Amino acid sequence: TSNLGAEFINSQQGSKIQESTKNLVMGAVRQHFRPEFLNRISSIVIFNKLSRKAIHKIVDIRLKEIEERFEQNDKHYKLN
Amino acid sequence: NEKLIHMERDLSSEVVGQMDAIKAVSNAVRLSRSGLANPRQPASFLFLGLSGSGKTELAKKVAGFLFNDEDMMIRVDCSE
């Protein structure tokens, strides 16, 4: 895993990372690791800006789990 | 020379086109294998063409033949 690509990914030019930005990331990755090392990786994957439309759902997941993991529901919220 | 020549013929057949390149290399390698080239000097070549042209593979095939192993190839990124 790596935030190496952040150097270009953090341009935030759309949540979906575009070709160009990704090639700059690729370049930088090859600068950091022997390209042959990298050529044994099945694929290099570039993650997108986590979209607000996603986050708007993620927080429900998190809030549910946050509460459920607090031992027993002797307190917690109704979580409305 | 004969081990090389039999392999040069396979090299010419395996590489798409680039026969002229193969022959240039073959000639120099034979000169060197014979001991006629001054032994102090390793053979060396400048592979001039298109990126994506197979120049690397030619060299790998040369390794694949002259040293009987394509994976013995040692590589240098000169742009970084």
Curated annotation (Swiss-Prot), chain A:
Induction field:
By heat stress dependent on the heat shock transcription factor HSF1 and the general stress transcription factors MSN2 and MSN4. Expressed at a higher level in respiring cells than in fermenting cells. Expressed in stationary phase cells and spores (at protein level).
Indicate which residues form the motif Nuclear localization signal.
Answer: 48-64
Impact of altering residue 57 to A? In NLS17KA; fails to concentrate in the nucleus
Subcellular localization is given as:
Cytoplasm; Nucleus
Any further remarks?
Present with 32800 molecules/cell in log phase SD medium.
Task: Describe the task this protein carries out.
Answer: Required, in concert with Hsp40 (YDJ1) and Hsp70 (SSA1) and small Hsps (HSP26), for the dissociation, resolubilization and refolding of aggregates of damaged proteins after heat or other environmental stresses. Extracts proteins from aggregates by unfolding and threading them in an ATP-dependent process through the axial channel of the protein hexamer, after which they can be refolded by components of the Hsp70/Hsp40 chaperone system. Substrate binding is ATP-dependent, and release of bound polypeptide is triggered by ATP hydrolysis.
Subunit-structure text: Homohexamer, forming a ring with a central pore. The hexamer is stabilized by high protein concentrations and by ADP or ATP. Oligomerization influences ATP hydrolysis activity at NBD2. Interacts with YDJ1. Interacts (via C-terminal DDLD tetrapeptide) with CNS1, CPR7 and STI1 (via TPR repeats); under respiratory growth conditions.
Family that this chain belongs to: Belongs to the ClpA/ClpB family.
Q: What is known of its domains?
A: Has 2 AAA ATPase type nucleotide-binding domains (NBDs) per monomer, a low-affinity, high-turnover site (NBD1) and a high-affinity site (NBD2) with a 300-fold slower rate of hydrolysis. There is allosteric regulation between the 2 sites. ATP binding to NBD1 triggers binding of polypeptides and stimulates ATP hydrolysis at NBD2. Nucleotide binding to NBD2 is crucial for oligomerization.
Full protein name: Heat shock protein 104
Which stretch of the intact protein is present? Answer: 726 to 805 of 908
